[PDB]
Amino acid sequence: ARILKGKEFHPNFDKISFGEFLFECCEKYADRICQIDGDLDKSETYSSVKTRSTRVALNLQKKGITSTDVVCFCSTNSLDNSIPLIASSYLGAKVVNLDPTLSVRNIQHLLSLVTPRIIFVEEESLKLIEKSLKGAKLSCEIIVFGKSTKHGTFAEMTLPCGDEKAFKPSKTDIDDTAVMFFSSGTTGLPKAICHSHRSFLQIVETSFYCGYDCRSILHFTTMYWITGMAILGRTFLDGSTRVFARSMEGEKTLQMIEKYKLTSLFVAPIYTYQLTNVPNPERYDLSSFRCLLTGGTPMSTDQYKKLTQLFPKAQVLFGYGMSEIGLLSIFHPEDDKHLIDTKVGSCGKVSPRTLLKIVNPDNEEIVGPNQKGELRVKSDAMMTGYYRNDSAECFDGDGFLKTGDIGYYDDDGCVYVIERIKEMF
Ligand SMILES: [Cl-]
Numbered sequence: 294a295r296i297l298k299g300k301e302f303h304p305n306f307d308k309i310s311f312g313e314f315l316f317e318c319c320e321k322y323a324d325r326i327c328q329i330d331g332d333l334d335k336s337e338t339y340s341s342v343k344t345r346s347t348r349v350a351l352n353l354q355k356k357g358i359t360s361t362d363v364v365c366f367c368s369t370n371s372l373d374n375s376i377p378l379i380a381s382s383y384l385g386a387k388v389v390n391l392d393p394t395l396s397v398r399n400i401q402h403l404l405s406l407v408t409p410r411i412i413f414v415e416e417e418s419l420k421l422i423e424k425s426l427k428g429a430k431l432s433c434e435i436i437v438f439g440k441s442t443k444h445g446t447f448a449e450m451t452l453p454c455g456d457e458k459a460f461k462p463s464k465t466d467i468d469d470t471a472v473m474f475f476s477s478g479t480t481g482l483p484k485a486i487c488h489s490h491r492s493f494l495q496i497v498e499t500s501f502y503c504g505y506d507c508r509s510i511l512h513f514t515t516m517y518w519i520t521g522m523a524i525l526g527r528t529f530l531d532g533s534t535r536v537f538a539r540s541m542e543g544e545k546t547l548q549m550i551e552k553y554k555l556t557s558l559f560v561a562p563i564y565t566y567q568l569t570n571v572p573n574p575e576r577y578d579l580s581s582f583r584c585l586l587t588g589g590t591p592m593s594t595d596q597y598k599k600l601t602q603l604f605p606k607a608q609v610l611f612g613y614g615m616s617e618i619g620l621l622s623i624f625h626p627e628d629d630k631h632l633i634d635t636k637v638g639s640c641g642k643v644s645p646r647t648l649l650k651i652v653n654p655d656n657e658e659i660v661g662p663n664q665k666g667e668l669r670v671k672s673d674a675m676m677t678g679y680y681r682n683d684s685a686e687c688f689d690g691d692g693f694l695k696t697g698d699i700g701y702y703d704d705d706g707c708v709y710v711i712e713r714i715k716e717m718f
Contacts, residue, residue, distance in 0.1 A: 310382070324340060328537070332539055346379040346380040350381070352450045362411075363388075369417075370538075373447055380450075382462075390522070404425055467491050472488045473488070479717050496523055504628070505610055508556045510527075510536065510556065511537070513541045543568050556581060557582070579606075580606055582606060584610060613640035617694055618675050622643050648670065650670075664701055666701070667697075
């Protein structure tokens with residue numbers, strides 16, 4: 294019986310705000326490509342992103358936004374959707390994303406949790422947001438990504454004014470909340486998961502030391518999901534390029550890998566079947582591709598194998614994580630290269646600077662390998678708590694996060710998740 298412990302690293306982003314992080318990354322990697330819209334074939338540099346976000350921030354400041362405010366976003370991925378998020382982060386404000394595919398009743402509840410001062414919304418989700426605010430009986434400024442007479446527009450927020458040259462992100466308390474997500478326990482309604490500047494930056498930094506290639510990474514998930522936000526943070530960290538597309542299609546994804554020379558892609562297992570059913574894949578030059586990132590539901594060994602055949606120069610990395618703490622287990626590309634072709638279907642090994650234990654609930658004691666129990670985890674990437682609710686029971690007597698998952702580990706420390714505990718809040 295032991296506690297699995299990931300490899301050490303020296304944190305470099307543990308003394309600053311998330312806004313200062315993003316700002317510094319922009320300066321460092323100014324001439325590199327920050328983001329590419331795979332659908333429209335448009336791109337933008339870190340330099341340009343810095344300019345537009347600085348202008349949005351200065352305007353947000355004039356509207357009275359400070360670090361205590363929550364700024365909300367409801368939009369699919371575009372070249373604009375992250376700009377006001379970055380801008381809001383410069384001011385130390387709390388940022389949170391809503392899923393445009395959620396019902397009015399679900400959005401209403403989410404808004405009631407975080408009661409935002411401003412919400413940026415895509416044109417397609419404007420009625421949804423208007424209806425939800427009306428239902429929740431909440432007042433909130435709406436700013437549209439597009440045209441509006443009734444509400445303000447994103448284009449207005451990018452209007453240059455003020456001392457752009459002198460602007461610096463606000464000094465703030467790095468243990469204050471920087472980013473929020475929403476819980477999904479097996480019972481009870483969602484709650485607002487709070488990450489501090491420190492905790493979120495450790496989600497990002499821990500993912501970097503997992504060692505996987507992100508130089509040019511494609512994804513489809515919106516910023517509602519931890520993966521969306523974590524990928525953005527991770528690409529900023531070393532001046533890599535984030536690529537997005539609205540919908541996953543097999544053919545178009547292979548075309549994008551060829552067209553942009555992608556090194557990586559994140560997507561849930563079930564969509565990978567669209568890749569493996571593309572006929573005559575050899576007609577695409579996929580030689581740039583190094584890493585298919587996946588997880589969240591189980592992947593069959595045959596599909597796993599088919600994927601390695603489709604991408605012969607790549608590794609397939611199936612990981613495990615959650616909104617409350619980021620990435621928890623995954624195989625290191627080089628250090629675990631041998632096991633990546635052997636030990637399917639595990640979730641990999643524990644991530645750097647992370648502790649993972651399996652606990653027998655009755656008796657409440659940690660167990661050895663090949664003994665199933667409740668997965669519990671602990672690291673500096675852990676959420677600080679809920680925004681207005683009580684996360685006390687999410688953590689055990691030793692301060693470990695209860696994942697709500699049942700699993701076990703190997704003699705070689707490979708992790709296996711098998712099921713969720715029923716009716717856990
Ligand atoms: Cl809450």
